[PDB]
């Protein structure tokens, strides 16, 4: 499932709202969803594989970001699944309000004798 | 070894400048050095164990933090390592110059008909 966004920001975390776990009722295995951050430079950033709970319903993923690296605008959202009976009402991603991190990092006379 | 900072910034990085691995010249084992990063509200933030090598002199170590979680102020920084022959000349903390990402977060006439 590939949501793309109208304005890229940074990525705090991305919200993942569900109407279905996909749990077949004659299998008692439980269903991942992973999520994969897509930049404006076309990169993946892996976001890890998590269980689909009803309890959790907004699953809130949040991104870890070295903060030696340089942050980077998200522009679309892969949530890759392998099951068919998972439904997803919408994708949401979570940014700063006060502030742009990526582009926040780009008088009298002196006399001297 | 506990180091305390005048300006209590984000730490980025911490740089950890040493002048002996610790290896003792009977002994194959190779030494670590744990850094705990110590916030304004005097909490721990453990950044893991590190081997000593005398290629990786600065010994940049990144801080990895949750975007999620708000930031904080760095005071100090506690470098605990269990092998007296381990000798460190200074201690740096790495911030973002241009911004301060914990306090960041902190017309004419209109008629209507």
Redesign the interface.
Known sequence: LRAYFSQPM????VIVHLVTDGTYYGDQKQETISVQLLDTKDQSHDLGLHVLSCRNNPL?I????????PFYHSQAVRVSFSSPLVAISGVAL?S?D??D?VT??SCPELAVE
């Open positions: 940074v990525a705090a975390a809130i949040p991104v870890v970001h070295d903060l030696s690296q979570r700063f006060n502030f991190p926040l990092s």
